[model samples]
Target: TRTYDGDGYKKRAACLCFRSESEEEVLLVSSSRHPDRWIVPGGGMEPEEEPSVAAVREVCEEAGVKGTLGRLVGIFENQERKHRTYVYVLIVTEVLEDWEDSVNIGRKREWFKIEDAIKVLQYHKPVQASYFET
Candidate 1:
């Protein structure tokens, strides 16, 4: 038997990225709220926005990178929080020198080996870390 709680749930959009297939370097950025922790580019979106569009917008806002949105990766529900995140795999096309969020909140963008990135991100779930492995 199962039950449902309508509260404590929020939708989120996120993207996993590589500079390109040839480079395969994962892109990670420091969280604005917790600058020491690393996270993929993503955030909550309006109810009206498409998940893919939200993901593309988030990546640009957080990392200043333009992405050619790719296939749907997966949807993950974190047990510890009210977050249900939609993940996508995107290829980085261009990185601007400046981004909107960087001006007000402070974000540091960097590229890392897939294995290395998996070790450092502040994600709560194993699947989130496993993203780099594939």
Candidate 2:
């Protein structure tokens, strides 16, 4: 995931931090560039990172949480934006009181039912929300 070569496409990674192994509950963070909008934790990949590697890294940074990365959720490709994202389902293992985004960008994280999350995600980032389409 680290290799966001940026070769015509925006390579990215993100995580849906689940409260457990099941997709019952997930953690989301407020959007920094927009108000009242939330998104699953994720970001641009590093030049050398693998997809899942950056997925976990983004989770820790964006949500201030750590977890075990499970199977890939899905690889979403947004045609218009040429955005390619690797999404993962993560089982949370720890929570930190302080995290990079929380302290630096005033990020807020909250828990919600997967259904709520799916709908919420649909509003701002439909591509990410489509992960639950199955």
Clashes of 1: 0
Supply the TM-score for candidate 1. 0.86
Q: Cα deviation of 75 in candidate 2 (Å)?
A: 1.0
The whole-model lDDT of each prediction reads 0.78, 0.85
Could you estimate the TM-score for every candidate? 0.86, 0.91
For model 1, which pairs clash?
A: none
Range of the 10 consecutive residues with the lowest summed lDDT in candidate 1: 1-10
lDDT for model 2: 0.85
Write model 1 residue lDDT over 1-134, tens digit each, in one string: 11123665677788987889664587888877678878778878666788898889888888889968888888777677767778898899898987987886878989988777887863544656865555
What local lDDT does model 1 show for residue 57? 87
- Candidate 2 per-residue lDDT, tens place, 1-134, comes to 33434467789888879899877998989999884898888889887678899888889988999978888868888888787888888899899998999889999999999889888988668887887675
Question: Which residue pairs in candidate 2 have backbone atoms (N, alpha carbon, C) closer than 3 angstroms, thus clashing?
Answer: 1-49, 1-50, 1-51, 2-46, 2-49, 2-50, 3-47
lDDT of 1: 0.78
The 10-residue segment with the lowest total lDDT in model 2: 1-10
